[PDB]
Amino acid sequence: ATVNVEVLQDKLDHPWALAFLPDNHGMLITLRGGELRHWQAGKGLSAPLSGVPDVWAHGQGGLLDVVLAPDFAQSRRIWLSYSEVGDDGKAGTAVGYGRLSDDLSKVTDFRTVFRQMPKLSTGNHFGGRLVFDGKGYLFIALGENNQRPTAQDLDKLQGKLVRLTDQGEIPDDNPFIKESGVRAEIWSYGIRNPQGMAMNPWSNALWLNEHGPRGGDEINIPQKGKNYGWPLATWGINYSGFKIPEAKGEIVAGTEQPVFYWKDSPAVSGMAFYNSDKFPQWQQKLFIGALKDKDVIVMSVNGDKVTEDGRILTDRGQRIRDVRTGPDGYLYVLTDESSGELLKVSPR
Numbered sequence: 622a623t624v625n626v627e628v629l630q631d632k633l634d635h636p637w638a639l640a641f642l643p644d645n646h647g648m649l650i651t652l653r654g655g656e657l658r659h660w661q662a663g664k665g666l667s668a669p670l671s672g673v674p675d676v677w678a679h680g681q682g683g684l685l686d687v688v689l690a691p692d693f694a695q696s697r698r699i700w701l702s703y704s705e706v707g708d709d710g711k712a713g714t715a716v717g718y719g720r721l722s723d724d725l726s727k728v729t730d731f732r733t734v735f736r737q738m739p740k741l742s743t744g745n746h747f748g749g750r751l752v753f754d755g756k757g758y759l760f761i762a763l764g765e766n767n768q769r770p771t772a773q774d775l776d777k778l779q780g781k782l783v784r785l786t787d788q789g790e791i792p793d794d795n796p797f798i799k800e801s802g803v804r805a806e807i808w809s810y811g812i813r814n815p816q817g818m819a820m821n822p823w824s825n826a827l828w829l830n831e832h833g834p835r836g837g838d839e840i841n842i843p844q845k846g847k848n849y850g851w852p853l854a855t856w857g858i859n860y861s862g863f864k865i866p867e868a869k870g871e872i873v874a875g876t877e878q879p880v881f882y883w884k885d886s887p888a889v890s891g892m893a894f895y896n897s898d899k900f901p902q903w904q905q906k907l908f909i910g911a912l913k914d915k916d917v918i919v920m921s922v923n924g925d926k927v928t929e930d931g932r933i934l935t936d937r938g939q940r941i942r943d944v945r946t947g948p949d950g951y952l953y954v955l956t957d958e959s960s961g962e963l964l965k966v967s968p969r
């Protein structure tokens with residue numbers, strides 16, 4: 622109705638993320654069941670690349686993010702996140718990197734450099750998004766594995782935003798490096814299940830989003846050492862309609878508020894800021910996928926504030942998993958379906 626939509630590729634089995642390859646070489650796409658594939662205009666979709674880690678493809682888990690290292694032009698390094706099982710059948714998020722071959726057929730010498738520990742998931746709340754800040758660091762979004770209180774526990778990597786160096790090492794200036802019992806990898810805590818994350822190109826700061834329970838999805842601007850409240854503070858309720866048992870309220874001293882929340886959850890997903898002159902009407906916007914509402918949320922970004930303009934893609938009836946702004950100034954969208962799609966989207 623308001624946007625143009627081109628289906629670039631169909632029949633994608635639960636795609637989770639995409640990464641644009643430089644010099645018009647197309648893109649990599651993760652399929653959550655465990656396949657990494659290459660798509661390129663005129664060539665279509667490749668067979669699965671070799672060298673990809675085995676994954677625990679159950680519930681919300683599987684093969685999750687794919688992100689190019691900032692120095693990809695020289696290193697050809699690509700990072701992946703995925704769920705990995707432990708010793709009691711429960712799982713946790715894992716993060717590693719390998720080198721993408723020149724011919725795009727394989728990932729070489731993949732190694733896992735970071736693991737969410739303990740592994741507490743039976744299928745839910747892995748997080749998984751990886752974002753490089755472009756100045757030496759890698760941010761890693763971790764859900765609380767559906768064990769609500771653990772998000773507050775600094776000895777556990779549940780419900781945490783992690784910051785590593787861009788090599789996967791622990792930074793010497795991380796907030797809890799000298800805090801007894803605490804995991805040094807932690808940047809922020811008190812998050813439920815983070816989904817989309819992206820660098821705001823106007824503030825050069827990380828923004829993230831997260832699923833609430835029954836309502837209470839959020840956009841946060843996470844800061845060093847800060848508590849985003851979950852499950853002591855929530856804008857949602859339990860699925861029963863009754864309060865989350867651990868919750869003290871919506872606004873709780875010692876915890877940080879989101880910059881936006883929805884009491885009716887879209888089930889927010891991948892997010893992309895738009896800062897291109899290709900489509901000037903989309904300048905200063907943030908586009909957020911909605912899994913439950915089956916569309917994309919269009920928002921106006923105003924410094925550290927954000928407002929909802931409306932929705933696009935609602936008429937297509939597809940759950941939306943990821944949204945990215947391409948180097949060409951188009952929006953690229955992945956749907957969360959058995960017969961999923963890669964869409965190229967532009968305004969009318």
Ligand SMILES: [Ca+2]
Pocket residue numbers: 811839849850851854855877878879
């Ligand atoms: Ca919160």
